[PDB]
Amino acid sequence: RKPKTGILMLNMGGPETLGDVHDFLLRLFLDRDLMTLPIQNKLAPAIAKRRTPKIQEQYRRIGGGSPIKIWTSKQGEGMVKLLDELSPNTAPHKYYIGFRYVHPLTEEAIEEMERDGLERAIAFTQYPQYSCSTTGSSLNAIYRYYNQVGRKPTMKWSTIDRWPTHHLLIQCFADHILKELDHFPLEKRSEVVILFSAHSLPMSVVNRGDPYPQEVSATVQKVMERLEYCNPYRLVWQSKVGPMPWLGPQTDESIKGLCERGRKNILLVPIAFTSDHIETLYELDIEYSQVLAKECGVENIRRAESLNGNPLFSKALADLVHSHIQSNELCSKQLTLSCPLCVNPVCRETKSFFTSQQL
Amino acid sequence: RKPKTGILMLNMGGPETLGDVHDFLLRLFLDRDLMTLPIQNKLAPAIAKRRTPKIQEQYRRIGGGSPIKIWTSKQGEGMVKLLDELSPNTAPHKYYIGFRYVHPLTEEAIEEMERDGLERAIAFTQYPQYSCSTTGSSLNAIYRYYNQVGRKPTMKWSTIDRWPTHHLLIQCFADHILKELDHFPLEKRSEVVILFSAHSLPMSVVNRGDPYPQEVSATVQKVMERLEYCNPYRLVWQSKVGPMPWLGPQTDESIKGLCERGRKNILLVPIAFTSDHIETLYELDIEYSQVLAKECGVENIRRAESLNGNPLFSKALADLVHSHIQSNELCSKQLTLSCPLCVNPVCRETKSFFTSQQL
Ligand code: FDE
Ligand code: FDE
Ligand SMILES: C[C@H](CCC(=O)O)[C@H]1CC[C@H]2[C@@H]3[C@H](O)C[C@@H]4C[C@H](O)CC[C@]4(C)[C@H]3C[C@H](O)[C@]12C
Ligand SMILES: C[C@H](CCC(=O)O)[C@H]1CC[C@H]2[C@@H]3[C@H](O)C[C@@H]4C[C@H](O)CC[C@]4(C)[C@H]3C[C@H](O)[C@]12C
Ligand SMILES: C[C@H](CCC(=O)O)[C@H]1CC[C@H]2[C@@H]3[C@H](O)C[C@@H]4C[C@H](O)CC[C@]4(C)[C@H]3C[C@H](O)[C@]12C
Ligand SMILES: C[C@H](CCC(=O)O)[C@H]1CC[C@H]2[C@@H]3[C@H](O)C[C@@H]4C[C@H](O)CC[C@]4(C)[C@H]3C[C@H](O)[C@]12C
Ligand code: FES
Ligand code: FES
């Protein structure tokens, strides 16, 4: 039976092999929803070529590529299997991967969905917390695709554009934290400090009204409530690049600082992505946990497992899609308010693209 | 009957009359738990003198003084009345006001609690969200007081050091929001944008690990959940001082930005203080809602009522104290973790002062 409902899973993606690194960086530096540069068509390929060796070396250090596509596929398969049973009236469901910067690209996915002759398409961001740099850019890509192709969609669109507090997402995080706490020496368990770590944003983005830091904070509070405040925590921010101001405190500085202050038993929790990727596998596991932590005299540093293949996680995904379908919503109320200092003309067009959909 | 349990309500306070402005600012610029200045004992008097006229003029514009003490007293009286019935084994209860920068000073309150011959003293911060600049400074004052008099306390101490998501606090905010939405023209209600406004922090404080922005964000999310996401929102940060980087976006710029982008129906919600004070009555009500709003072409700008004398709020205070007593807690789990980059030696001493209490 040919698919009726398509679920477009949106994420930035990551290079699957070392050879994919250059083009990943090229698309990233070309993305005007992420950043603007002078002579950008000329300077993007230059930054790409320059930064490829360094990024290739990071991927080499974790086994030679990003597991993002593997994990997304596994999650998508599990989601669809559940959706066919939850929602027989919208079945068969099919998932499509729409990566922003690697194949399959958002635009390739839309093309395939349109060729597949779907009745309905759901833009399902894989970032639980909304940033204009992440979910916003992916949704802008969908608007721009139709705008540049010069045709209206042949399917009904809607979006699940954020889900920072979904009950089953919270349960998955709390489960993975509890199981990692079990791996500390018993005598250190109550002394463990939890560092929730989410990718940082430049202050220029924070200061224009980006919703992300507040939503990430909300996920943290729900997880800690579920854990009954069993250990103390901070929310800290990783992987700032370059010399400009970004939102801190930095995850690396925090680890060092805790160690210097006698807090030598630390649990890292990636709170803003749902699968392993370069920043858990390289940055947290290698750079912070193996190198820095050792230099600083840590006693025990561990990282909670990414959600990856947890069946409760694909259950959260299917629950979200099913509730979205049942509610008839086209997007969250939050999407209807652009950043107070948004200077990107496309964000309003994208918002309208979703709110104006037939149905 | 002589009081058994003292509830020390901690708040920065504000000058009750125009003549109180100078000493208020003197104490604030002298506070080493708030800020670090070279030759601070010498510089603080010069800073206070310079800024007194500007601050006096703000207070004149709102009727000549701060209502903080009035609202604190009312809230304290209602709390005590409830506590005498909720907790007869710790009754009679007495509230004491400990303002950081005006009379009655934290130190004067402690002196009076000790003279009153209490069995138990609860340091009850009136800031629901913990910052080291606010609650931390007030709790540090308590430790420093005993350190300076060179005497141990004659009463058992404990602290309610944060309460960002207390269910009755959330219900009060949501209630006041719904009440204010009812005052917009009916035809604009769904179009209203909610701007949660909390005092900003300097980025130097944010970047050392201050807990405040994440706890404020948690209060915001719980209110919006209770409101069923009826209107879109942002959390924005008010009244940065001086030229250094502070956490944004700023409330004033956001108001201007929203107006410029066609969002002309705005509800301001003070989310991080529980009574009116100079920044609601002057900054929000006059500077932003009267002057800025008019300049930008606003259609409707309103501000949700501060919690003030709401009886449900007194009930929240009493339920917090009651739970704290029943739990036997000495402080939150969060207080047992100092900021990862804390450089104030008193924070650890204060933390130990509470965690080490007999009982
Ligand atoms: C502006 C901005 C904003 C943002 C945001 C964000 C969020 C929320 C999350 C995120 C993430 C990320 N990133 Fe992000 N971001 C950005 C950016 C960027 C850049 C520029 C890059 C590249 C880096 C280098 O080193 O080159 C990135 C990058 C990034 C990454 C990595 C990728 C690879 O290498 O593979 C990740 C994972 N990012 N992110
Ligand atoms: C560093 C820092 C931090 C902080 C924080 C905070 C929070 C959380 C809250 C707050 C608040 C406040 N403040 Fe705050 N803060 C600060 C500061 C400050 C200063 C310097 C001042 C004074 C200003 C002037 O103008 O002079 C203030 C200030 C302030 C105020 C006012 C007072 C009067 O006038 O009365 C208020 C209400 N603060 N805050
Ligand atoms: C990084 C990740 C392992 C995650 C983990 O063990 O925690 C692994 C799992 C499967 C791996 C990939 C698959 O084994 C297939 C490829 C095998 C090649 O030898 C290298 C690239 C290659 C594309 C792999 C790169 C990387 O090692 C992957 C993506
Ligand atoms: C780190 C990299 C330097 C490339 C190189 O010379 O190797 C530079 C090139 C362009 C920079 C970005 C662009 O200037 C646009 C953004 C501007 C913000 O002020 C900081 C983040 C911001 C996203 C920058 C981060 C970083 O400094 C980048 C990515
Ligand atoms: C600003 C506040 C009113 C807040 C509001 O409008 O809700 C009012 C309420 C009661 C007022 C105070 C009281 O009326 C008593 C004093 C009267 C004097 O004429 C001025 C200072 C004085 C100490 C007042 C200052 C200020 O106008 C107060 C504090
Ligand atoms: C506003 C005032 C300037 C006095 C004047 O000339 O009017 C200055 C004097 C001391 C300053 C503060 C101190 O330098 C300490 C803090 C330093 C942080 O980087 C910013 C906030 C911070 C709290 C400063 C804010 C503001 O710039 C202050 C308060
Ligand atoms: S940058 Fe946030 S809506 Fe445009
Ligand atoms: S500055 Fe936060 S604990 Fe000392």
Domain match, B45 and B84 both? yes
Write b or e for each residue in A32-47: b if 16 or more Cβ atoms lie within 10 A of its Cβ, otherwise e. Answer: ebbeeeeeeeeebeeb
Residues B266 and B157 in one domain: no
Q: After which residues is chain A broken (C to N over 2.5 A)?
A: none
What kind of experiment solved this structure? X-ray
Where is the domain boundary, A270, A285, A306?
Answer: A306
Q: Residues of A with CB below 8 A from B165's CB?
A: 221, 225
Q: What is the 3-state secondary structure (H, E, C) of chain B?
A: CCCCEEEEEEECCCCCCHHHHHHHHHHHHCCCCCCCCCCHHHHHHHHHHHHHHHHHHHHHHCCCCCCHHHHHHHHHHHHHHHHHHHCCCCCCEEEEEEECCCCCEHHHHHHHHHHCCCCEEEEEECCCCCCHHHHHHHHHHHHHHHHHHCCCCCCEEEEECCCCCCHHHHHHHHHHHHHHHCCCCHHHHHHCEEEEEEECCEHHHHCCCCCHHHHHHHHHHHHHHHCCCCCCEEEEEECCCCCCCECCCEHHHHHHHHHHCCCCEEEEEECCCCCCCHHHHHHHHHHHHHHHHHHCCCCEEEECCCCCCCHHHHHHHHHHHHHHHHHCCCCCCHHHCCCCCCCCHHHHHHHHHHHCCCC
Query: How many angstroms separate the alpha carbon of residue B131 from the centre of ligand 6?
Result: 18
Nearest-Å Rg of the Cα atoms of chain B is 20
Number of domains in chain A: 2
Which ligand is located closest to the Cα atom of residue A201?
Answer: 1
Burial of residue A84 (CB within 10 Å: 0-12, 13-18, 19+) is middle
**Biggest alpha carbon distance in chain A?**
64
Chain A nearest CA to B214, separation (Å) = 5
For residue B282, give the CATH number of its domain: 3.40.50.1400
Together in a domain, B270 and B295: yes
User: Are B234 and A193 inside 8 Å of each other by CB?
Assistant: no
> What DSSP element (H or E) covers A59?
helix A40-61
| Residues of chain A found within 8 Å of residue B296, distances taken between Cβ atoms | none
Measured between beta carbons, the chain A residues lying within 8 angstroms of B249 are 206-209, 339-341
Give, as one character, the DSSP assignment of residue A333.
T
**Of A123, A116, A119, nearest in space to A140 by CA:** A123
3-state SS track over B327-355:
HCCCCCCHHHCCCCCCCCHHHHHHHHHHH
Q: Based on the fold, state whether residues A295 and A354 are members of the same structural domain.
A: no
Q: At what angle do helices B311-327 and B167-181 cross, to 10 degrees?
A: 170
Q: Which of A232, A263, A337 sits opposite B334 (nearest CB)?
A: A232
Residue A16 is given by DSSP the state S
The CA distance from B281 to B238, in Å, is: 13
Q: Using CA atoms, how far apart are residues B244 and B242, in angstroms rounded to an integer? A: 6
CA distance A179 to A100: 33
My answer on whether A189 and A301 are in the same domain is yes
- The answer to whether A94 and A8 are in contact (CB under 8 A) is no
* Cβ of residue B51 lying under 6 Å from some atom of ligand 2: yes
How many angstroms away from the CA of B332 is the closest CA of chain A? 9
- Check CB contact under 8 Å for B341 and A249: yes
Q: Is the CB of A129 under 6 A from ligand 1?
A: no
Same domain, A135 and A1: yes
* A227 near B CB under 8 A: no
Residue B85 has φ and ψ, to the nearest 5°, of -85, -35
Tell me: do A5 and A146 sit in the same domain: yes
How many CB atoms sit inside 10 A of residue B341's CB?
Answer: 20
Q: Could B245 and A245 be called an inter-chain contact, meaning their C-beta atoms sit closer than 8 Å?
A: yes
Cβ A340–B257 below 8 Å, yes or no? yes
Provide CB contacts within 8 A for A349, sequence distance 6+: A143, A147
Q: Whose CA is nearest to atom 12 of ligand 5?
A: B65
Task: Give yes or no for A263 touching B (CB within 8 A).
Answer: yes
Task: State the best of A189, A217, A296, A332 to mutate against chain B, taking most chain B CBs within 10 Å.
Answer: A217
CB of B339 sitting under 6 A from ligand 8: yes
Is the same domain home to B23 and B140? yes
A1 burial class (0-12, 13-18, 19+ CB within 10 angstroms)? exposed
Residue A84 is classified by DSSP as: H
Q: Which domain holds residue A258?
A: 164-306
Contact A330, A357 (CB under 8 A): yes
Residue A179 and residue A155 in one domain: no
Specify the resolution in Å. 2.0
Shared-domain flag, residues B254 and B274: yes
**Among residues B272, B275, B222, which one has the least CA distance to residue B247?**
B272
CA distance B153 to B138: 17
Distance between CA atoms of B320 and B169, rounded to whole angstroms? 10
The answer on A347 and A201 residing in a single domain is no
Which residues of chain B does A249 touch, with a Cβ-Cβ cutoff of 8 Å?
206-209, 339-341
Distance from B223 to chain A by nearest Cα, in Å? 11
Pick from A306, A331, A349: which residue ends a domain?
A306
Note whether A206 and A132 are same-domain residues. no
Q: Which ligand 5 atom lies nearest to the CA of residue B308?
A: 7
Spatial neighbors of B300 by CB under 8 A, at least 6 apart, are B184, B185, B188, B192, B264, B265, B266
Report the Cα A220 to chain-centroid distance in Å.
15
Residues of chain B positioned with their CB less than 8 A from the CB of A340:
234, 236, 249, 253-255, 257-258, 261
Mutation target among B254, B341, B343, B351 for the A interface, most CBs of A within 10 A: B341
Span from the CA of A60 to the centroid of ligand 3 (angstroms): 10
The C-alpha of B236 sits at a distance from chain A's nearest C-alpha, in angstroms, of 7
Query: What tokens does B72 get?
Result: 């604190």
Q: Is A45 on the interface with B (CB under 8 A)?
A: no
